[PDB]
Design a protein around this nucleic acid. Structure first.
Length: 1044
DNA sequence: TCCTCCATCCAGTCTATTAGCT
DNA sequence: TAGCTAATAGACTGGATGGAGG
């Protein structure tokens, strides 16, 4: 016979596979006949070997053994000598009789039989021993007795205790092992052929669905095929005009989105297209989504010139996935149901976006619609109203918009003729991601079929880069949809703009793209109106989105967004609030809270996260109304404390629009603050620093090393060691840069350096010194003590090099033997309540909250002790006042939003007294007489800590120091003393705990700090009484009154 | 130009508890 | 079973980085 075409393929793949490997599987439907193909494969290896070629064909049943023995000799092109092993003599027959050496179970007979075969005057081409799995051991009994190895071994019906003996050479000596079945999966799941280091990879596969089509969530292979695609390009790139055309394809892509894209990124984008194209075709069934779409066509075009060049789609391995889709999408909102799944099953896993809650999306649509109605008199469906969704994602903000229209049409207020034009001409949206674009298109196209029409209004772009520059084409039809869009007077901008303020440093791949023309817009508006000088947040993507939309909007229109709600009350957003109040007439701000970068009570008050695990930021819905008017007013509502994620959504389903919300009329103040407005009388109080007649001449803010795991630690020795590793690692990168002379820069250097966070913790400044050739010495003298957290003092390598921000610490603590007092305070915009803690040592920025200011008692000079304040009495007076409950409560807003101001109080000398005591207590926090009721049970003297805990949640009576020591009868009120938002006692639990740095793998063990095994236990106990004592003292200081 | 240094807000990820599994 | 793994609920960090002023 002549081997069928796909059999040739299998033969080819087999040979190619066994060229490097020694194990392979062969999957075919029962119909084709793998038995014949196996012979033809065996022949090819026989051709190559140039000697007697030995094959072992293992088989379960007796019927198969005879069907293969006979059927092979008939189909054999070669000279074949056959061997049967079995307890049935008749099993080696065909009519015919004794076909090959007779069947036998006698190993000595099987061994001597091969001696015969060798004794022949002439040996045939290949020797095929057909055997049962049951008696396979006789082969082992033969190969031991003097039988040769097997050049090839074949297991048929491979889904199968001697059945498992084959895999190891120890049982049967053989060079290569092929596995053939039609069903590696046994029907739960009992048996599956997944190598197990035995079955091996598969070089060929045939689906039953294929053959019928051929006329006869586990996907890691997408990597394999893509790696083949991506690599073959870069190779062929190398002056092959394809490179000239593909380098033209990237430039076209670069045009439509970013210079960010290049050979790698662009090639990756086409990979994803090749994979999903058949899925989209399969989904469509009758009418091709691919042929219609511009990007598809643009992608389905560029493939051609490469397809011409001896490059195919390597997705033959992916065909069973395609078949499942073809089955799943045959015939058939039941189609949208598939779109839900395929996304979650395939796409989520395959290549690895934020899913916007429907209750949110619907809310602004109604809100935008009712706004268009009440104000302009117009509506959502008018001819001269255009709607843009600049960050479509999956087109959720369109899908739910046309659904609103559908509800309107059923109510009869709308004509489908009024809908159709919107879908066609008046609805626009765009995405920056390939897969998000496709899915977004379909989902609108499909949800429009409710009443086949492609969506004409979708682009694939970076809306920010759109208005940047105005200057050969691929995708030329794509931007045409956008070019024609750009003349539209867009009356409404809608959606969920991106949130991004930056990164953590060594994720260099991530850094907010520079949009120079938009930054300048931000710079002249939001940044200009600010009083801050630190405006990082104003270049956050969501603030860019408001800017870009504010520009792209027309004088008569509206915006509706779900965004980061930080700008509502934020230090660096005072300018943005000044702008929005001028640039807009009516602004409804719906604060959804849900900020979980807080902690403690604040965290509980914030509550549910609107995007769940999607975002940790404060969320708020903003609808900005723009008309011609002399009227300017803010409308604000706090959704309320403590609400769950779905409690908040229950309100969004309940209230579909901003018409039904009880708004608060807000008149912004001098500081452009909408909420938590300050007291203008508070300004009469004596300034603390930076003004005339201020109490302190100089204030500092806590240190920020930017690499705590390396530079700070409980063990002084560990700091010395760890710092030296990094300094060595850093000076090596420099030595590398030394002998590769270029014009290096503070950012370009990234490509020539390590990026491994187990080696170096890069920061901006450190990169700058690597752009130059700068080395360092390790100065052991620079290792000193510092307050890292309240009542937690670690060792710190304070070094201008390797510390991103050393602040004024060299003025307040010139060396590790210096003597100074500083009053740490919560700084400028903490959400937690205001607190203060005095320190005898250098203080981190996070001693209190996220940004901590400190007020030194002394400043030093190297040319020099200098009084930074008049007297000790004045110093401790300040410390006394900052503890006043009335003071803290009366001006919570001024304490949050700016540096404190101290008034002159009626019983001042009393404030000094308690000021001193409080200081005396908080400095000696680590050794204090234990409180009365407390008891300490110690089984054995194990004073080492792993992690302190309460036996159950919120039992404040007890703390398990470890599995030996426990502390009981702790007064529950001691937890009322709070620094930041956390009790002092809980800081010890939190801080004095064994943990490792996930990034660097640097361990930090608090037991290595103190030399005294009872330090932490002593510290804990003391802090409890410090807590109790502090509260007593806070209750002693006088009634809050003015004017001494 | 580029460096020094003030200033401020961050589109989840880890651990702990409870319920299952052979 | 003893003591794991899986499902579910709870808790909440260190640092990047624009721009004034050299």
């Amino acid at each position: 016979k002549k081997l069928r075409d796909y059999q040739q393929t299998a033969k080819e793949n087999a040979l190619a596979h066994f060229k490097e490997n020694d194990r392979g599987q062969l999957i075919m439907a029962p119909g084709t006949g793998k038995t014949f193909t196996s012979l033809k494969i065996s022949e090819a290896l026989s051709k190559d070997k140039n000697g007697p070629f030995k094959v072992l064909y293992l088989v379960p049943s007796i019927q198969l053994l005879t069907q293969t023995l006979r059927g092979w000799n008939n189909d054999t092109e070669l000279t074949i000598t056959s061997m049967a092993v079995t307890s049935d003599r008749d099993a080696s027959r065909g009519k015919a009789s004794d076909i090959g050496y007779p069947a036998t179970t006698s190993s000595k007979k099987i061994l001597q039989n091969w001696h015969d075969f060798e004794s022949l005057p002439k040996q045939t081409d290949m020797l095929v021993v057909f055997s049962t799995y049951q008696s396979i051991e006789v082969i082992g009994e033969a190969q031991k007795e003097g039988f040769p190895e097997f050049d090839f071994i074949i297991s048929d019906e491979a889904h199968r205790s001697a059945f498992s003996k084959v895999h190891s050479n120890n049982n049967v000596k053989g060079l290569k092992r092929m596995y053939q079945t039609a069903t590696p999966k046994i029907y739960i799941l009992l048996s599956s052929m997944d190598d197990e280091s035995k079955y091996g990879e598969v070089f060929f596969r045939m689906g039953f669905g294929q053959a019928v089509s051929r006329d006869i969530n586990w996907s890691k292979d997408v990597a394999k095929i893509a790696e083949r695609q991506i690599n073959w390009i870069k190779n062929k790139l190398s002056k092959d005009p394809i490179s000239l055309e593909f380098k033209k394809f990237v430039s076209s892509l670069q045009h439509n989105i970013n210079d960010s894209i290049d050979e790698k990124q662009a090639a990756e984008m086409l990979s994803q297209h090749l994979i999903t194209k058949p899925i989209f075709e399969a989904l469509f069934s009758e009418y091709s989504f691919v042929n219609q779409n511009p990007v598809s066509q643009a992608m389905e075009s560029i493939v051609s010139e490469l397809e011409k060049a001896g490059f195919a789609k390597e997705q033959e391995n992916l065909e069973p996935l395609y078949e499942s889709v073809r089955m799943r999408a045959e015939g058939i909102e039941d189609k949208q149901k598939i779109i839900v799944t395929l996304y979650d099953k395939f796409f989520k896993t395959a290549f690895k976006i934020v899913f916007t809650p429907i209750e949110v999306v619907d809310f602004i649509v109604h809100s935008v619609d009712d706004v268009l109605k009440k104000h302009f008199g117009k509506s959502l469906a008018s001819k001269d109203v255009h709607i843009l969704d600049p960050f479509t994602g999956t087109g959720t903000f369109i899908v739910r918009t046309l659904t609103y229209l559908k509800e309107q049409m059923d109510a009869g207020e709308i004509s489908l003729s009024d809908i159709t034009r919107k879908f066609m001409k008046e609805l626009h949206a765009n995405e920056i991601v390939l897969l998000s674009y496709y899915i977004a298109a379909i989902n609108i196209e499909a949800t429009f079929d409710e009443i086949y029409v492609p969506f004409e209004g979708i682009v694939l772009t970076d809306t920010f880069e759109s208005t940047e520059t105005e200057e050969d084409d691929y995708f030329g039809t794509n931007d045409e949809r956008l070019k024609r869009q750009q003349e539209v007077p867009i009356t409404a901008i809608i959606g969920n703009p991106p949130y991004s303020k930056g990164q953590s440093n060594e994720n260099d791949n991530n850094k907010n793209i520079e949009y120079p023309r938009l930054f300048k817009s931000i710079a002249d508006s939001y940044v200009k109106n600010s009083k801050t000088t630190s405006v990082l947040g104003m270049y956050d993507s969501y603030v860019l989105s408001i800017r870009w939309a504010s520009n792209r909007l027309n004088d008569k229109g509206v915006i509706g967004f779900v965004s980061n709600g930080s700008y509502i009350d934020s230090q660096s957003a005072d300018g943005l609030r000044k702008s929005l109040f001028k640039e807009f007439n009516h602004l409804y701000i719906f604060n959804l809270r849900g900020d979980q970068r807080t902690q403690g009570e604040t965290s509980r008050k914030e509550g549910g996260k609107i995007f769940g695990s999607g975002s940790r930021t404060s969320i708020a819905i903003s609808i900005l109304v723009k008309d011609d008017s002399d009227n300017h007013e803010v409308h604000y509502h706090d959704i309320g404390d403590y609400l769950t994620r779905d409690d908040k959504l229950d309100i969004l389903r309940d209230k579909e629009s901003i018409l039904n919300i009880d708004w608060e009329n807000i008149s912004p103040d001098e500081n452009n603050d909408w909420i938590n407005q300050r007291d203008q009388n508070y300004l009469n109080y004596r300034p603390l620093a930076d003004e005339n007649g201020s109490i302190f001449s100089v204030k500092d803010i806590g240190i920020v090393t930017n690499r705590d795991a390396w530079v700070s630690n409980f063990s002084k020795i560990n700091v010395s060691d760890n710092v030296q590793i990094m300094i060595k690692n850093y000076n090596l990168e420099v030595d590398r840069l030394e002998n590769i002379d270029v014009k290096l820069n503070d950012k370009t250097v990234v490509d020539y350096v390590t990026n491994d966070e187990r080696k170096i913790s890069w920061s901006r400044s450190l990169k700058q010194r690597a752009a130059r050739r700068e080395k360092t010495q390790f100065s052991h003298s620079d290792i000193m003590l510092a307050m890292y957290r309240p009542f937690t003092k670690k060792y710190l390598y304070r070094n201008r090099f390797l510390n991103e921000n050393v602040r004024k610490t060299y003025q307040t603590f010139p060396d590790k033997n210096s003597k100074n007092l500083l009053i740490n305070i919560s700084g400028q915009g903490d959400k937690a309540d205001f607190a203060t803690l005095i320190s005898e040592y250098l203080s981190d920025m996070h001693v209190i909250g996220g940004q901590a200011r400190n007020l030194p008692r002394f400043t030093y000079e190297t040319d020099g002790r200098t009084d930074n304040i008049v007297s000790d009495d004045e110093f401790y007076y300040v410390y006394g006042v900052l503890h006043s409950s009335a003071y803290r409560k009366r001006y919570a807003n001024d304490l949050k939003k700016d540096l404190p101001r101290i008034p002159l109080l009626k019983n001042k000398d009393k404030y000094v007294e308690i000021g001193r005591k409080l200081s005396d207590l908080h400095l000696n926090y680590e050794n204090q007489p234990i409180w009365d009721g407390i008891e300490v049970e110690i089984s054995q003297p194990d004073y080492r800590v792993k992690k302190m805990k309460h036996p159950k949640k919120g039992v404040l009576d007890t703390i398990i120091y470890n599995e030996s020591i426990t502390i009981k009868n702790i007064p529950e009120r001691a937890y009322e003393y709070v620094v930041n938002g956390r009790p002092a006692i809980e800081w010890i639990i939190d801080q004095y705990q064994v943990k490792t740095d996930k990034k660097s793998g640097i361990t930090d063990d608090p037991n290595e700090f103190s030399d005294n095994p009872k330090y932490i236990l002593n510290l804990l106990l003391s802090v409890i009484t410090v807590s109790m004592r502090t509260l007593e003292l806070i209750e002693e200081l006088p009634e809050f009154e003015i004017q001494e």
